[PDB]
């Protein structure tokens, strides 16, 4: 299963 | 000496005490009687907590404890007896009630009837002693849950042995609805939808 890559928006602040 | 050893000699000796309790200077005699009736009450709850003997012998013990908690206990002398009486019931705890709850809605016809009526005396005498530990234990043992579930199809069940059994069933539920704490546990059982599937109305 290809790993779900959550978005940049959550990753980097602010 | 034969409280839990064998289930054959107690039967002959258990029924004789049953009828004797119903067929019942004066102060001295009244003390000896009440004294043994209290001691005789202990060995009954002790056997029920261990589930000893066959359902037939286990049924006789319910009748003995029934009249004892209904006639003897029911005025400083009354308070002392009622207080000490509840102590014996609390000694066993859920272990004792669990056995009685399993007897209900069982295979035998007379054991389930006596067991159901017995619970009525326990909750009744407990309130006289705004809450109660007996009613709380029944909820933890999932007794109130399965009890409300059996309300469905009551028309099929309802002198006859099945009729008298249902009388004690509905009679018990009526007692729990008198205390303030019972409405909480009883209402959460969704009894309104249980009495509708039966179509009794």
């Amino acid at each position: 299963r290809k790993a779900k890559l959550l978005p940049m928006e959550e990753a980097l602040l602010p | 000496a034969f409280s839990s050893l064998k289930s054959d000699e107690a039967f002959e000796l258990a029924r004789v005490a049953k009828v004797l309790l119903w067929k019942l200077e004066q102060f001295t005699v009244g003390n000896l009687i009440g004294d043994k009736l209290f001691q005789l009450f202990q060995l009954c709850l002790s056997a029920i907590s261990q589930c000893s003997g066959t359902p037939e012998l286990r049924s006789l013990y319910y009748s003995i404890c029934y009249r004892y908690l209904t006639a003897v206990v029911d005025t400083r002398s009354v308070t002392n007896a009622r207080a000490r009486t509840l102590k014996a019931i609390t000694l066993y705890g859920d272990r004792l009630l669990n056995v009685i709850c399993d007897d209900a809605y069982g295979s035998d016809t007379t054991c389930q009837t006596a067991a159901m009526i017995l619970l009525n005396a326990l909750v009744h005498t407990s309130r006289a002693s705004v809450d109660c530990p007996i009613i709380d234990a029944l909820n933890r043992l999932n007794f109130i849950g399965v009890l409300v579930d059996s309300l469905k199809e009551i028309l099929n069940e309802w002198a006859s042995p099945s009729q008298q059994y249902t009388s004690a069933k509905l009679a018990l539920l009526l007692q729990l609805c008198q205390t303030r704490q019972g409405a909480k546990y009883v209402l959460q059982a969704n009894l309104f939808r249980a009495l509708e599937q039966s179509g009794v109305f």
Binding site: - | G93, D94, N98, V130, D131, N139, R140, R180, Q181
Partner: protein
């Protein structure tokens, strides 16, 4: 301090535990707060924590009492206190179990050292059960089954020997422990171990 206990005392005598806790907690009487909080939690330990349920509304107040009792270094006697933080861990064990996070839930139960998983620990774990609060022994039935069902699921996914060994351990523990619904539970536990083999 007295009247807050007086008012808390009656409301306690009227089965209003959720209030008696807030009131006793107002007077910083942790002996009673945690006592009552033990009673309100044990029934809801294995239940499903769902929005606005009675579990969330009680768990969330218990945690708000765990922080304020640690940040302020407050505690009742170890009996009442040990049980209180133990239930909070179990509530986490079932909240993870009901969510399908099997790996995460297995790790929690392992820390608690409540259920033995290696045959060597059976003797000591069995002795501990004797003096643990009945609010814990009550929920032993659901704990064994969840833990078993946890190993049960992980089996269908050497490791096989390890799960098999742990499966056995749970059974022997349950066999030596007299507890709630030991009949139905001990039977189901044995069946789930047979399907593994």
């Amino acid at each position: 301090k007295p009247i807050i206990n007086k008012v808390a005392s009656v409301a306690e005598n009227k089965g209003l535990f959720e209030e008696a806790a807030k009131l006793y907690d107002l007077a910083k009487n942790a002996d009673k707060v945690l006592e009552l909080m033990n009673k309100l939690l044990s029934p809801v330990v294995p239940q499903i924590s769902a929005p606005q349920s009675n579990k969330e509304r009680l768990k969330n107040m218990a945690l708000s009492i765990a922080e304020r009792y640690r940040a302020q270094g407050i505690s009742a006697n170890k009996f009442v206190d040990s049980t209180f933080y133990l239930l909070l861990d179990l509530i986490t064990f079932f909240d993870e179990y009901h969510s399908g996070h099997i790996d995460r839930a297995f790790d929690i139960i392992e820390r608690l050292k409540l259920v033995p998983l290696n045959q060597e620990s059976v003797e000591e774990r069995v002795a501990a059960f004797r003096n643990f609060s009945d609010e814990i022994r009550h929920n032993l039935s659901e704990v064994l089954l969840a833990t078993m069902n946890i190993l049960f699921t992980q089996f269908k996914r050497d490791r096989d020997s390890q799960l098999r060994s742990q499966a056995r351990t749970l059974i022997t523990f349950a066999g030596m422990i007299p507890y709630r619904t030991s009949g139905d539970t001990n039977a189901r536990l044995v069946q789930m171990e047979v399907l593994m083999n």
